[PDB]
Write a protein that binds this ligand. Structure first.
Ligand SMILES: Nc1ncnc2c1ncn2[C@@H]1O[C@H](CSCC[C@H](N)C(=O)O)[C@@H](O)[C@H]1O
Ligand SMILES: Nc1ncnc2c1ncn2[C@@H]1O[C@H](CSCC[C@H](N)C(=O)O)[C@@H](O)[C@H]1O
Ligand SMILES: [Zn+2]
Ligand SMILES: [Zn+2]
Lengths: 333, 153, 357
């Protein structure tokens, strides 16, 4: 539905705060900041020699946190492209995430170690707690306002901490239905409201409302707002995301390189988008204020927009025949 | 399939089945965007369903406004006037060799003029039917058909 | 579009001018017993089977209403215009006059003729009310006035605000889809405020109308002398057809008149009454040509025509005639028309008394 030839080795992308720019990582380890309106590249940053697998914009949009595969995280000013700060860790980093309401702070999910929240002003770090002490794979994310931290382990356990004190404000373990746990693949939140989603190893996305987890307390049984899956193919989900408003949810079937689109309230599947059967789906993102969806597959990015009835359909356009309502004086002088 | 079910399917798929583009026939016209099978519903000429006695009063009205008349005779009693309110079917050119044909259907008591496909129409093709305009005293035709009457009338 | 040849429908063909005197070759002479249509002279049963009556309004389903100036009437076999007597010694004295037809009307009384309604016009014979669904339409009675003074009524049973019936008279050439006054051959009243409508022009030379009005309609046209000042001959057309399951007769109606000169029928007038109380004169200028009482419906209007013997506020005139009287007068007149046409074609000669009546 529209691709870009000007970028190669697309690996990970991230919309800015207003959905005007897109920073995509490349295998060479370069940042390609490409613009939507001019439909061209806005910037090229020599980030790492190692490909970049995690990228996040700052709220003001002037900072981008990038993670190399060399366990090298670095902050870059979008105007200049300089490495503002640079750090390295053990247990290679799985993800970075700016704090949405404090760009000085940034959480980092490493591979084998617990996620740690650092600051840029001071090169300090706060290691977030781990429930089972043996997960070795815990994804973590700020909420919409950056007030709480949601951490999900490979054993389905879900901890909600407060971002400042790291104190356990809520907890619950998700189930595979019967009695078993499932590897929490990812935690996503809505940029609007409080609904969030969890991708798990059961290939079943679970949509909740964080207020219900907060009122559920520690070690409770919160039910999901929704349960979403491909009941037909039972396909895993490499990457999923909400819509900009938060009423549409998309999942990327890397198994068959497709895109499933459900709703939030009803949860019925909006639609499906099919990509090149030969392409391996890698990354998925939604335009924050547009029905536009960016996909990264086999190093190539594709764009999926959604237009209205007009752009040619605007006499007064009607859809179905209209019986004329004759009047009393319809034949009168 | 039921004419109501077929009509619902047609009204669901019409917006994505056909388009309007610059036409080598004349100006802008209806082109096929997805291969259309023979006899299937191509498009409704949707519009204002009126009685026949009110045609002239409308026509002269448009004649007073310099606006072209978009009217098709449903039957001796009804007419779909699409001059002011219509759909994309107002951009179907005519060809002496049409791959389409107009037929009136009755859904729940109301008549609908649907252009169906005379043959298996493929993507990109411009949609044309037989207007069957009576012989006047002359509109030249540029449909490109080898059998072209040189005139609709 | 072919040639001056066989008719436009292979269902039945009338004898063309080149096939003169070709009677309608419809049903074959070999009939089945049936039983239902085996009525004899000893039985007392009306052969004209009226349809089943339903309180909700209904539609005549297989009647091709008039069009293109082409009138459509019911038909009955009538195998012999009755002239059977004893076997006279002279075997070339009498003529049977086998018209093999008649204009028998499917009506117990003079009512709103179903042959002259629009396909969007519903009737309820519980009160013979007429109703519609979309816009305006027009229906007419069975009879038609040619001379003299007469009178009828309309009873209104339902008049919501978006419901405005119109009631009056209309000559043939009146398009039964138009609202009874859209042309110059129709003169009616609008049942919102009493307003005379003719040539689609509304005039307030009238009284006020009420929702439950039982309105009386008086109308006087001159004798056919002052109407024609010439021969009022009535040479009729008669064509036999066998529509889907029943026999019917076609006749040629009049053509759209381009009359733009005003020659009012002498001393003709129309008077309107509200429950007998004189609402006043409606139209003094009355064009020539026969007229008939007519009703126009707007969206869901409920009104009905009514004759004289069951009246509520009747005039005590000894000259005016109710609907039923002129109705059977015209019925007998058309009977004689069939008689005279079958005479003309069947037996040489014609002869009529001292012309005046
Ligand atoms: N086959 C044909 N031969 C000659 N003229 C044609 C034609 N088909 C369409 N036209 C002309 O095109 C007009 C279509 S009305 C549409 C106007 C214009 N094509 C537009 O897109 O805005 C008709 O009035 C007719 O004059
Ligand atoms: N063979 C033909 N010759 C001349 N005009 C034609 C034509 N076939 C279609 N048209 C045009 O079609 C119009 C009636 S329907 C309009 C459909 C037309 N394709 C459009 O784009 O608007 C007429 O105004 C006439 O101009
Ligand atoms: Zn042509
Ligand atoms: Zn042609």
């Amino acid at each position: 539905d529209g691709t870009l030839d000007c970028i190669s080795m697309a690996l990970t992308c991230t919309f800015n705060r207003w959905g005007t720019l897109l920073a995509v990582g490349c295998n060479d380890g370069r940042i390609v900041i490409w613009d939507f309106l001019t439909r061209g590249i806005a910037k090229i940053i020599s980030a790492h020699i190692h490909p970049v697998c995690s990228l996040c914009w700052s709220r003001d949009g002037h900072k981008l946190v990038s993670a190399s595969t060399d366990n090298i995280v670095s902050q870059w000013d979008v105007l200049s492209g300089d490495c503002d700060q640079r750090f390295r860790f053990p247990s290679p980093i799985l993800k970075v995430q700016y704090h949405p309401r404090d760009q000085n702070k940034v959480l980092v999910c490493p591979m084998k170690s617990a996620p740690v929240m650092l600051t840029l002003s001071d090169s300090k770090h706060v290691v977030l707690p781990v429930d089972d002490d043996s997960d070795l794979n815990v994804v973590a994310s700020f909420d919409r306002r950056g007030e709480y931290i949601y951490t999900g382990n490979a054993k389905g356990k879900i901890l909600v901490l407060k971002t400042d004190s790291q104190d356990l404000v809520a907890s619950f373990r998700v189930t595979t239905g019967t009695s078993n746990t499932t590897a929490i693949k990812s935690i996503e939140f809505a940029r609007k409201g409080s609904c969030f989603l969890i991708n798990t190893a059961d290939r079943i996305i679970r949509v909740y409302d964080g207020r219900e987890i907060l009122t559920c307390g520690r070690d409770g049984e919160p039910e999901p707002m929704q349960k979403l899956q491909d009941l037909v193919n039972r396909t895993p989900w490499k990457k999923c995301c909400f819509s900009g408003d938060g009423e549409y949810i998309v999942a990327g079937s890397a198994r068959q390189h497709a895109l499933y689109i459900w709703e939030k309230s009803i949860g019925n599947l909006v639609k499906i988008l099919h990509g090149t059967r030969g392409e391996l789906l890698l990354d998925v993102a939604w335009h924050p204020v547009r029905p536009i969806i960016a996909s990264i597959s086999s190093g190539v990015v594709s764009i999926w927009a959604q237009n209205q009835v007009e752009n040619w359909s605007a006499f007064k356009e009607l859809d179905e025949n209209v019986e004329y309502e004759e009047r009393e004086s319809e034949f009168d002088i | 399939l039921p004419m109501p079910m077929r009509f619902r399917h047609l009204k669901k798929t019409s917006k994505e089945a056909v388009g309007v583009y610059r036409s080598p026939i004349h100006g802008r016209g209806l082109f096929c965007k997805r291969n259309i099978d023979a006899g299937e519903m191509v498009i409704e000429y949707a519009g204002i369903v009126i009685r026949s006695i009110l045609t002239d009063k409308r026509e002269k009205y448009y004649d007073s406004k310099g606006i072209g008349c978009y009217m098709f005779r449903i039957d001796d009693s009804e007419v779909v006037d699409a001059t002011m309110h219509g759909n994309a079917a107002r951009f179907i050119n005519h060809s002496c060799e049409p791959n389409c044909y107009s037929r009136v259907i009755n859904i729940d008591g109301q008549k609908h003029i649907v252009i169906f496909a005379m043959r298996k129409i493929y993507r990109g093709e411009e949609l044309t039917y037989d207007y069957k305009f009576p012989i006047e005293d002359k509109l030249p035709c540029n449909c490109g058909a080898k059998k072209c009457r040189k005139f609709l009338n | 579009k072919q040639s001056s040849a066989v008719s436009t429908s292979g269902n039945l063909n009338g004898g063309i001018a080149a096939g003169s005197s070709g009677k309608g070759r419809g049903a074959k002479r070999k009939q089945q017993d049936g039983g239902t249509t085996g009525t004899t002279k000893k039985a007392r049963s009306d052969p004209l089977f009226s349809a089943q009556r339903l309180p909700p309004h209904g539609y005549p389903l297989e009647h091709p209403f008039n069009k293109d100036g082409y009138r459509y009437i019911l038909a009955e076999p009538d195998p012999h215009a009755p002239d059977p007597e004893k076997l006279e010694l002279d075997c070339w004295a009498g003529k049977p006059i086998p018209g093999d037809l008649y204009r028998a009307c499917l009506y117990e009384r003079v009512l709103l003729a179903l042959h002259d309604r629009a396909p969007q016009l519903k009737i309820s014979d519980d009160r013979l009310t007429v109703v519609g669904e979309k816009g305006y339409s027009m229906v007419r009675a069975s009879h038609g006035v040619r001379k003299g003074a007469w009178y009828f009524e309309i009873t209104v049973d339902e008049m919501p605000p978006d419901t405005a019936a119109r009631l009056g008279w209309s000559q043939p050439l009146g398009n039964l889809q138009a609202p009874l006054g859209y042309d110059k051959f129709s003169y009616s009243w609008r049942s919102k405020k009493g307003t005379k409508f003719h040539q689609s022009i509304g005039k307030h030379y009238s009284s006020g109308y009420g929702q439950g009005d039982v309105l009386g309609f008086y109308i006087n046209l001159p004798e056919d002398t002052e109407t024609a000042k010439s021969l009022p001959d009535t040479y009729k057309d008669k064509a036999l057809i066998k529509f889907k399951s029943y026999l019917y007769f076609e006749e040629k109606d009049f053509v759209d008149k381009a009359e733009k000169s005003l020659k009012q029928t002498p001393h003709s007038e129309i008077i309107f009454y509200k429950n007998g109380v004189n609402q006043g004169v409606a139209y003094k200028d009355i064009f020539e040509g026969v007229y008939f009482p007519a009703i126009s419906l707007y969206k869901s209007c409920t009104v009905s025509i009514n004759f004289g013997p069951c009246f509520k506020y009747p005039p005590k005139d000894l000259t005016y005639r109710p609907m039923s009287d002129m109705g059977w007068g015209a019925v007998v007149e058309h009977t004689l028309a069939d008689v005279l046409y079958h005479v003309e074609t069947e037996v040489d000669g014609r002869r009529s008394p001292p012309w005046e009546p």
